[PDB]
Amino acid sequence: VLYVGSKTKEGVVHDVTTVAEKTKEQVTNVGGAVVTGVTAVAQKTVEGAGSIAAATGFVKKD
Amino acid sequence: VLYVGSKTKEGVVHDVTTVAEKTKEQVTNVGGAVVTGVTAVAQKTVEGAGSIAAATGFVKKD
Amino acid sequence: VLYVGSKTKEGVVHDVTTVAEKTKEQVTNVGGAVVTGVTAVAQKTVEGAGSIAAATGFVKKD
Amino acid sequence: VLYVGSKTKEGVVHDVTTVAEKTKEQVTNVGGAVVTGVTAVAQKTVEGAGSIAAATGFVKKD
Amino acid sequence: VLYVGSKTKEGVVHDVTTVAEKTKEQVTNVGGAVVTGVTAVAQKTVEGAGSIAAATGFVKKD
Amino acid sequence: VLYVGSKTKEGVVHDVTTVAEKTKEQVTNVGGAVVTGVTAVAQKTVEGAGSIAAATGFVKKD
């Protein structure tokens, strides 16, 4: 194996643009999970049994 | 293996731009989790059983 | 293995830009977790059973 | 005018790959110009009368 | 004018890769110009009358 | 004018990779100019009349 003048990009996030203007936003939350923002997760390896990799807005009442 | 003039990018986040202007935002939260901001997680390796890698807005009432 | 004039970037976050102008933001929080800011986590290795790697806005009532 | 999370690329050259293997190449040159290599020119502005912008393999016997 | 999380690239050259293996190359040159290598020129502004901007392999017998 | 978390790249050269292996190269040169190497020129402004900006392999017998 050999790379010459190359580029590898395993597991990335880029160029996320969010323009929000003139916004009203009310939220009442009891017990649950409210997610209103921007999220960006970048993982190469996530190993494991029962694992929860990159949860967002999660409610687990086991 | 050998890299010449190369670039490797395992597990990265870049170029996240969020423009917010003229914003009102009210939040009442009891017990739960409210997430309104910008998040960026970059991990190469996350190993383990039952592991929770990069949770965001998480409520676990086990 | 050998790298010549190379660049490796395992597990990084860069170029996170957040412009916020003219913002009102009220938050009442009882018991839970409110997360309104910008977060950036960069880990190469996170090993362990039941581990919680890079939690953000977390409520655990086990 | 305003750019948000943008990219401008006025006048560029990129991703020029030339693989040459097992090559014999003889050149005799008298008076003239022999050009056998790879060239990449990138200019934003070249102004002027009679100007010669980015000549390659040029012979001028005025 | 205003740029937010932007990128401008007026007049650039990048990612020029030339792999040459097992090459014989003879050159006899009398008076003229022989150009066998890799060249990369990057100029933003070149102003002037009669100017020669980025010549490569040039013979001028005026 | 105002830049926030930005990048400007007026007049640059980058990521020039030249791998040469097992090469024989003979050159006889009388009077003229032989150019066999790698060249990279980066100028922002070159002003002037009759100017020669970034010549490479030049012979001028005026």
Task: Label this structure with key terms.
mainly beta, 62 residues, homohexamer
* Number of separate helices of chain A: 0
Structural class of chain A: mainly beta
Radius of gyration of chain A: 18 Å
Helix content of chain A: under 10%
Percent strand of chain A equals over 45%
Query: Count the strands of chain A?
Result: 7
The description of the largest β-sheet of chain A is: none
PDB class: protein fibril
Keywords: amyloid, protein fibril
Assembly: hexameric
Entry title: The cryo-EM structure of Ac-G51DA53T P1 a-syn fibril.
Notes on the protein architecture:
The structure is a homohexamer of 62-residue chains. With 62 residues, chain A is mainly β. Helix content of chain A is 0%, strand content 68%. The first copy, chain A, contains no helices and 7 strands. The radius of gyration of chain A is 18 Å and the shape is flat. The N and C termini of chain A lie far apart (47 Å). Chains A and B meet through strand 1, strand 2, strand 3, strand 4 and strand 5 of A and strand 1, strand 2, strand 3, strand 4 and strand 5 of B. Chains A, B, C, D, E, F: It is found in: Cytoplasm; Membrane; Nucleus; Synapse. Chains A, B, C, D, E, F: Belongs to the synuclein family. Chains A, B, C, D, E, F: This is Alpha-synuclein.
